[PDB]
Symmetry: D2
Subunit: 122 residues, 4 copies
């Protein structure tokens, strides 16, 4: 069918996320449980909010979301595309930017990390 | 505090308006790009995001998604709101622009990266 | 047993590269055969030039290199780190930037793609 | 007529680099003096090695180089294009990846930072 974002996912790093119903404007909300973190602070489940692109109602749509971490001053944004193979196996191929907080504008240059994640269903 | 609400323009000439930021840090708005990857006519597009409220920083991090209404593509922006040495607010952001590809074997080439600096308009 | 860049490698996309000897300053040269390309033009083997970081002569050093494509106006740069496991299996975890040419500076914004690659020995 | 990498440059952060002659294969070397650093160590001038793309011998070519930092375990790679306006004013629009060292492969995910730089000539 269409590749749908709703439901439960895990990534190559062991992180989980659950996304709820996608409304008619493509808006969704959920939660994200990272399996990894940059430092010793305790991981807390964090909210995410995003949109799926609905133009031409593609069966493999692009999308993006923001994770607003509840245990860091940082923000991660993820963007990717939902693929589906002939057996109906779904996968999200994503890239992210992780923005840290810096105290001063002179340190902005070092504030942004980059990486990928591949998510498959639970 | 450096506040996301209001009207902004970037180094490329794009405009965006962000509304009120609620108690969970959620905001919505609209984005008018000045530039585009292809010939399709530009349309104003919704954005949705969140500002980080931990320690209620006067210069908080944030992120938002632009759900383009004239492309199959998605752009995500993340940055931090600074209050500059001239007293001006400025958003320093980096973005990932995801294009749609028909086949998973082409995924590798789908994601572009860049920056934008926004100032108030 | 240090993780050494010299020799023949293949990545998750099927691309091959062969790196020669790494000199005492960490400098190396080689060739890169991509398995994929952005367009229809025929792929040609292309030169690469790089450096491995030698500070503290780490057994898992960072490195970078430039691929000077011989069939495109484009350039790709890769940067990563060479890892080992105790049975001696080496792997390079890398991220790349692929710079396309544009014929007007007003189009610079779109010129740069980003991704990852994982290489293992042949 | 062509935008040439050789010579002395400075970027929006204040960093300087000097690039030497670009040979017929497009190979160059030089030195990089960052104005900024992620941590307290004293900044040391560092070698760079790169190539400019010569396909179709464009007057505004792409290029890339690696900076092998002499004061960190880290590596930076820069890639971009040399632009030249009608008065002959040159500028390098670049983007970079900064790879830090991590002790364990389980930390790889956090190792890579991203950003941009714009360089203009020093006469
Ligand atoms: O599934 C996935 N998980 C990872 C990737 C992309 S998002 C990433 C999780 C990041 C959570 C924040 C974090 O680890 C964290 C934790 C504690 C920090 C303490 C102090 C910090 C100071 C500056 C910057 C930080 C950035 C992230 C930090 C922390 C800091 N995919
Ligand atoms: O303010 C800022 N503006 C720029 C930067 C980052 S977001 C970027 C604007 C992106 C608009 C979407 C687009 O270009 C677009 C439009 C139409 C497309 C039609 C067909 C496409 C086919 C493949 C790939 C595409 C990629 C982007 C496309 C389009 C396509 N900052
Ligand atoms: O092993 C790996 N392979 C891939 C990844 C990162 S490097 C990439 C291979 C790049 C080959 C050059 C290319 O695709 C290429 C070739 C011809 C082009 C002609 C015209 C272009 C116009 C705009 C943008 C381009 C981008 C890449 C192009 C070409 C163009 N890892
Ligand atoms: O002109 C430009 N300059 C900046 C940008 C991109 S390259 C960047 C300079 C990087 C110098 C290395 C560095 O800061 C550095 C120095 C010491 C470090 C010690 C320990 C580290 C541990 C983890 C990560 C690091 C990242 C950079 C580090 C260092 C570490 N443009
Ligand atoms: C992901 O979900 C599984 C069970 O449904 C659980 O074992 C695992 O702990 C979860 N991951 C994280 C990082 O919480
Ligand atoms: C941004 O706003 C200014 C002032 O209203 C306007 O003149 C300009 O055309 C707008 N730009 C775009 C891309 O809509
Ligand atoms: C890489 O090497 C393998 C084994 O030698 C070979 O079969 C394959 O064709 C090579 N790939 C490319 C892209 O040349
Ligand atoms: C670069 O050179 C300029 C003048 O040539 C100098 O004023 C500046 O301090 C130098 N910057 C660095 C980082 O060395």
């Amino acid at each position: 069918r269409k590749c749908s974002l709703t439901g439960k996912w895990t990534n190559d790093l062991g992180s989980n996320m659950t996304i709820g119903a996608v409304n008619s404007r493509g808006e969704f909300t959920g939660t994200y449980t990272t399996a990894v973190t940059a430092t010793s602070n305790e991981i807390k489940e964090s909210p995410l909010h995003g949109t799926q692109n609905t133009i031409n109602k593609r069966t493999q749509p692009t999308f993006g979301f923001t994770v607003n971490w509840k245990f860091s001053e940082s923000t991660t944004v993820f963007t990717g595309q939902c693929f589906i193979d002939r057996n109906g196996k779904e996968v999200l191929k994503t890239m992210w930017l992780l923005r840290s907080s810096v105290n001063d504008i002179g340190d902005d240059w070092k504030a942004t990390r980059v990486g990928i994640n591949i998510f498959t269903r639970l």
